[PDB]
Design an enzyme around this catalytic site. Structure first.
Site, PDB file in Angstrom:
ATOM      1  CE  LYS D  71      -2.428   5.902 -46.918  1.00 13.96           C
ATOM      2  NZ  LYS D  71      -3.564   5.060 -47.370  1.00 13.96           N
ATOM      3  N   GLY D  72       2.582   4.969 -46.409  1.00 12.95           N
ATOM      4  CA  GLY D  72       3.972   4.620 -46.597  1.00 12.95           C
ATOM      5  C   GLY D  72       4.800   5.544 -47.460  1.00 12.95           C
ATOM      6  CG  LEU D  73       3.925   8.166 -50.394  1.00 16.37           C
ATOM      7  CD1 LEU D  73       3.322   9.260 -51.229  1.00 16.37           C
ATOM      8  CD2 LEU D  73       5.054   7.504 -51.141  1.00 16.37           C
ATOM      9  CB  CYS D  74       6.976   7.952 -43.709  1.00 17.42           C
ATOM     10  SG  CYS D  74       5.263   7.720 -43.269  1.00 17.42           S
ATOM     11  N   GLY D  75       9.193   7.863 -46.033  1.00 15.77           N
ATOM     12  CA  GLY D  75      10.544   8.003 -46.517  1.00 15.77           C
ATOM     13  C   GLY D  75      11.613   7.604 -45.530  1.00 15.77           C
TER      14      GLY D  75
END
Ligand SMILES: Nc1ncnc2c1ncn2[C@@H]1O[C@H](COP(=O)(O)OP(=O)(O)OP(=O)(O)O)[C@@H](O)[C@H]1O
Ligand SMILES: Nc1ncnc2c1ncn2[C@@H]1O[C@H](COP(=O)(O)OP(=O)(O)O)[C@@H](O)[C@H]1O
Ligand SMILES: [Mg+2]
Ligand SMILES: [Mg+2]
Lengths: 208, 52, 140, 121, 72, 281, 177, 104, 52, 70
Positions: D71-75
């Site tokens: 998932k790509g909301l890691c920042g």
């Protein structure tokens, strides 16, 4: 509307002479839907809408490029490449404006690669649309720059196709044309390589 | 016919007409007197005719 | 509940209802925070999921049909069965039927002494702890 | 007009609780996973105690694995080790070695093919 | 073709042999412990080789009893 | 997307500098392009009503219609900004009376009321000075009846009355996209269709900036070209798919190859619909 | 013989000539280990450090004086200053004694290293202590093992690994106190 | 917004009321089906703020079912009109009450 | 979200200090002593300045 | 006064108030104003400009300051 029209219809170019009219128009409380600016909008060929949100970003002149229009922006008048680079700059800036909320909330590190490419090119052309003025050098100190039209057309076509991705964003800030951004980038990368030993003082114990 | 002003955003995105009505919108210190002073300084000296 | 106020109701209601409605208002207050938070139930804590399950139990408890008002002694034992235990097994879709199971299954002798004494005396608290266990809840 | 900002307030007010719920979900997941990381950290010690640690070897074939997220909301996590991968693929390769690039996580297969399209396998 | 122990001559890597032995130890545990050891046994991922940089066929894994004892 | 029939009222509503006059001038110029290929009873005689504009804009349009050749089918009624507010109030009705000659006698008209909002402003001035009590946005009460009795004269007459038509193209300018204004909702409630032009699509290179979602046509495909009807329904549904897939396109890392399919197809159709102005196809 | 003396320090300069200077050097897994193999010490007499490890759990970081490992040649016992070995452990019982007390973890197999600084690293995958194995499901597993006759050498080796664990697990619960 | 999805007739199901929606007059099964449709559509309305940011990968298949059920219901509330045959090329459909009760 | 025992030792000192300040801002009231029983006390200014 | 303001800005912009802790500058600049000889205040107020003698003498007297803490 009839007061403003009966005034503004006398300012025209007739067949026997010409009047080139530049008019400042105040907008009350920074509102463009106020009836006096919204009525003045119909009477003008060229429009230059200056924004407070762009002046607070340090960009000067604070022209909104997505709200300042003209009738001369027509490929049958100014030429095909001038119109193409103007519409490309406007499309890059509108695509950047469409991402401002998701840059604010999710951050810059959550975008796509074309998104964080067009955001970087848009931030370069935002600073590159600013320019030091010759009359504004008495309170700023930076000298003014009269840019030719061919210089700015070619300089923006380069940033649109991508000849200057490696240059920093702040190299475009307050420069005349596309030579001065390279000279500013060289001067500002000397500044991150400028280190001296013993600070070449020679101030103490002068000779008489 | 175009009126070259020397200003990058004006010459690129909203070019001024030689003999046309031009408006400078904005409110309370955004720079529409400095912009009109720069338009005087750039256009009026390279004009030849009279100014008011 | 977050916006509806009764600015006289602090000690102007039924005493037997006042025994349970303080805990009802407090555990719904903690549900009105995390309710909009955790729509999802994929990854939870064990603490917020307890508040979310009690609050969902009390929410589906508190609704009622039109043109059928309940006496105060019979809604007091339903809120007593919902703020205490006795109802944490029906998921959410049975608490309307579970409350009707409570009202139909509980010995109606407690309603008379609750209506007469006004509050839940500790003897009636013991019999209400007891009689709420021998009901047949429809949670299958 | 006056219901445009009244609905925008609703949208941003719900995002301001969705992101806080997601913050607490990530915090509980980090609390549950830290005890597994600290138990798994021990077994890596005997192999780097026996076999040493030799990153700058003159290998002929190397396999580089970039452990990214799904998932790509890691920042800024999966993009930072892509910087370290292009700084590491340009460190060992100085002599004509064959390099395979492998990625664990969807944000690795979305980002290592960007700069490295042919050695990714 | 190969040479070595009974797993290396059977075309089995050491990781698969040791995971097979670990799964067979997990299978014979007590029920307070075999249910907890059911958790560390599940394999859930999917791989896809990228021969071009854009595409590739996929193989998923949804295993619950452990590593595959049969050759893949 | 929003086909227009001979006899309906199609509003061109948008903001300032978005392409309303350009759509109307393409509608005028295309009539000269088609009038050389059709018989006598199929020609359309345009009437352009220019209320509150400059004399420079009307002179630029008369030069454009002369250089195209469209003046021999076009009347130009123009009560400009320097004219009195009664003249700007009456210029749409005078233009509709001039086009009702072609409607009433079996020919076809195309009346274009440019800036019906400017007529409303002039009528408000003329009424407030006649001491009539103002209402919402200081407009009179009968400003709906003002545009209603004007736009109802665009009609497709029966076979008993000659079969002539009149097509109105009223142009309403909104303020920052606010179509919830008084005059905008009045003319939106009157007219059949809406050609809504957005500023945010105008600077995305989508020119003419037709917001495909909010633009409708209540005649619909009853008065479309067949053949265009065979493919335009597919175009409508695919552009609806492209509209609903959007606000997920910020994440180009996340491929799907099922929504990415309709995304690339809708973007193909989006770039298909773009068109350089003053050259109708 | 040592034609590329690599290392964490030797990777730093080859990195810094070809990495951007804004990127700091990545850390290495040897930097997170406090004890190495080569440097002399960390035994001090009778009690030597044993590091029992599994992937999911650390089972001992204590100091023992003898550890009995089930190597593939047979159950050997590591005393304090044992010879450096890399000993592959077959499935058996690891006994860790710190005195009179012993803890007996039956393991699944995996290597054990005695190092030149006297530290011992047991590295197994599944290591159950002896009272939490089911003593009735061993025979019902190995009957289905030894009764399964495979055709491929892969399933033959998997069955051989089944019997070599289950017969040793029979001998691990039978006669133990 | 209901017509923006293409669902015609664009009747907003969580805005349309009736005095005839008592169970005393339309019975129990019609009332329970109507309230259940409105319940799953309010649930979809409350989950639409999550699935428009995330995209239905954080609902653990307990509310992934109700989103597909609500999508099937929102599609099924559309109906071809006999008077809309001249707009769109689809013949009209008159649905009886027992059939729509059983279908929903 | 993390816990009580996560923070530093000076953080524990400020947590203890502010938790005992918040109680010291409480004060019983002389008018409330008829339906609460406990007497209330008028605090002087320099007394609370010295106490805090 | 304006001369004690430009001496403060000259002490802080020319790096002389470097190494000072940021909660200590509100005392350090009082130390700069008090401890430095007032002749530079009088010269700077009189000729109204930092002369090439005055910056040389000003750096010299800004080296002889007891900034708190050091
Ligand atoms: N389809 C198009 N392609 C390219 N340029 C267009 C298109 N439509 C309009 N423009 C440009 O938009 C500019 C603004 O003129 P336009 O016709 O938009 O005026 P308007 O919006 O109808 O009325 P107003 O000027 O009062 O706002 C013109 O210079 C025209 O060249
Ligand atoms: N080109 C420019 N460069 C730098 N500053 C500017 C520029 N244009 C405007 N400003 C700032 O705006 C201020 C005043 O703007 P002004 O021209 O007076 O706007 P207005 O006439 O609308 O009040 C100036 O003091 C200056 O600081
Ligand atoms: Mg001014
Ligand atoms: Mg117009």
């Amino acid at each position: 509307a009839t007061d403003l029209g009966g005034l503004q219809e006398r300012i025209t170019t007739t067949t026997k002479g010409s009047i080139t009219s530049v008019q400042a128009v105040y907008v009350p409380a920074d509102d463009l839907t106020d009836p006096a600016p919204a009525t003045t909008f119909a009477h003008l060929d060229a429009t230059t809408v200056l924004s407070r949100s762009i002046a607070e970003l340090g960009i000067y002149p604070a022209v909104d490029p997505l709200d300042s229009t003209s009738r001369m922006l027509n490929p049958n008048v100014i030429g095909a490449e001038h119109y193409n680079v103007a519409r490309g700059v406007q499309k890059v800036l509108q695509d950047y404006k469409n991402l401002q909320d998701i840059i604010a909330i999710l951050g810059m590190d959550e975008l796509s690669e074309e998104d964080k490419l067009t955001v970087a090119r848009a931030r370069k052309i935002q600073r590159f649309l600013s320019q030091p003025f010759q009359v504004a050098e008495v309170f700023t100190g930076t000298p003014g720059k009269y840019v030719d039209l061919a210089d700015t057309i070619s300089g923006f076509q380069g940033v649109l196709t991508g000849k200057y991705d490696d240059l920093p964003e702040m190299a475009f800030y307050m420069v005349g044309d596309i030579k001065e951004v390279k000279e500013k980038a060289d001067k500002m990368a000397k500044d991150i390589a400028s280190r001296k030993e013993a600070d070449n003082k020679k101030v103490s114990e002068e000779l008489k | 016919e175009i009126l070259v002003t020397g200003i990058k955003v004006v010459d690129l995105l909203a070019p001024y007409q030689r003999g046309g009505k031009i408006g400078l919108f904005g409110g309370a210190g955004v720079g529409k007197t400095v912009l009109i002073m720069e338009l005087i300084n750039n256009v009026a000296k390279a004009h030849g005719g009279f100014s008011v | 509940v977050g916006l509806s106020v009764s600015r006289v109701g602090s000690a102007a209601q039924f005493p037997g209802m006042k025994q349970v409605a303080g805990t009802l208002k407090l555990e719904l207050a903690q549900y009105r925070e995390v309710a909009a938070f955790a729509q999802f139930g994929s990854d939870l804590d064990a603490a917020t999921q307890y508040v979310l399950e009690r609050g969902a139990r009390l929410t589906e408890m508190l609704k009622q049909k039109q043109f059928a008002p309940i006496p105060i002694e019979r809604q007091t034992v339903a809120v007593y069965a919902a703020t205490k235990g006795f109802l944490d097994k029906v998921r959410v879709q049975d608490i309307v039927a579970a409350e009707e199971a409570v009202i139909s299954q509980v010995n109606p002798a407690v309603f008379k002494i609750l209506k007469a004494n006004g509050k839940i005396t500790p003897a009636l608290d013991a019999h209400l702890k007891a009689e709420l266990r021998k009901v047949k809840l429809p949670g299958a | 007009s006056n219901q445009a900002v009244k609905q925008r307030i609703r949208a941003i007010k719900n995002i301001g609780k969705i992101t806080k719920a997601m913050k607490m979900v990530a915090a509980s997941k980090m609390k549950n996973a830290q005890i597994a990381v600290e138990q798994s950290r021990g077994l890596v010690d005997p192999f780097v105690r026996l076999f040493g640690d030799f990153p700058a070897v003159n290998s002929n074939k190397s396999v580089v694995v970039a452990v990214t997220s799904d998932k790509g909301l890691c920042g800024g996590l999966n993009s930072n080790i892509t910087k370290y991968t292009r700084a590491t693929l340009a460190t060992t390769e100085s002599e004509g070695k064959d390099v395979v690039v492998v990625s664990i996580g969807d944000k690795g297969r979305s980002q290592l093919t960007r700069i490295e399209s042919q050695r990714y396998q | 073709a190969p040479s070595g122990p009974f797993y290396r001559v059977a075309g089995m890597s050491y990781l698969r042999y040791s995971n097979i032995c670990a799964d067979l130890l997990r299978n014979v545990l007590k029920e307070p412990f075999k249910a907890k050891a059911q958790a560390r046994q599940a394999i859930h991922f999917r791989q896809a080789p990228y021969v071009d940089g854009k595409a590739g066929a996929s193989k998923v894994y949804e295993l619950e009893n452990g590593i595959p004892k049969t050759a893949n | 997307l929003v086909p227009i029939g001979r006899g309906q009222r199609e509003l061109i509503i948008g903001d300032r500098q978005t392409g309303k006059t350009a759509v109307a001038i393409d509608a005028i110029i295309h009539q000269k392009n088609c009038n050389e290929q059709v018989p006598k009873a199929q020609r359309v005689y345009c009437v352009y009503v220019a209320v509150g504009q400059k004399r420079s804009t009307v002179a630029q349009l008369v030069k454009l219609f002369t250089q195209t050749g469209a003046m021999r089918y076009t009347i130009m009624v123009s009560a400009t900004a320097s004219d009195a507010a009664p003249l700007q109030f009456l210029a749409p009705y005078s233009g509709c009376a001039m086009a009702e000659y072609f409607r009433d006698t079996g020919k076809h008209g195309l009346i274009i009321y440019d800036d019906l909002s400017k007529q409303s402003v002039a009528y408000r001035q003329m009424s407030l000075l006649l001491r009539r009590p103002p209402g919402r946005e200081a407009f009179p009460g009968d400003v709906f009846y003002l545009h209603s009795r004007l736009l109802e004269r665009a009609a497709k007459l029966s076979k008993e009355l000659g079969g002539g038509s009149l097509t109105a193209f009223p142009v309403i300018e909104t303020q920052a996209g606010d179509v919830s204004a008084y005059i905008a909702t009045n003319v939106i409630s009157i007219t059949d269709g809406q050609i809504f032009l957005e500023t945010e699509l105008f600077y995305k290179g989508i020119r003419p900036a037709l917001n495909v979602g909010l633009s409708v046509s209540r005649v619909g495909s009853a008065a479309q070209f067949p053949g265009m009807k065979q493919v335009a329904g597919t175009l409508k549904l695919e552009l609806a798919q492209y509209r609903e897939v959007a606000a997920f396109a910020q994440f180009g890392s996340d491929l799907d190859a099922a929504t990415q399919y309709v995304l690339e197809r809708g973007a193909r159709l989006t770039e298909m619909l773009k068109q350089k102005q003053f050259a109708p196809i | 013989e040592a034609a590329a003396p690599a290392g964490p320090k030797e990777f730093t300069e080859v990195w810094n000539k070809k990495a951007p200077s804004t990127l700091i050097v990545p850390e290495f897994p040897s930097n997170y280990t406090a004890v190495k193999a080569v440097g002399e010490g960390q035994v001090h007499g009778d009690a030597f450090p044993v590091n029992f490890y599994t992937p999911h759990s650390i089972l001992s970081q204590a100091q023992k004086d003898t550890v009995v490992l089930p190597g593939v040649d047979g159950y050997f016992g590591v005393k304090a200053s044992h010879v450096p070995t890399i000993a592959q452990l077959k499935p058996g019982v690891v006994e860790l004694h710190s005195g009179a007390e012993s803890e007996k973890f039956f393991v699944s197999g995996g290597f054990a290293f005695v190092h030149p600084n006297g530290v011992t690293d047991i590295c197994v995958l599944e290591a159950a202590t002896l009272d939490q194995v089911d003593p009735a499901a061993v025979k019902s597993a190995l009957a289905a093992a030894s009764a399964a006759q495979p055709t491929d050498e892969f399933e033959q080796a998997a069955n051989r690994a089944a019997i070599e664990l289950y017969s040793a697990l029979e001998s691990a619960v039978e006669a133990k106190a």
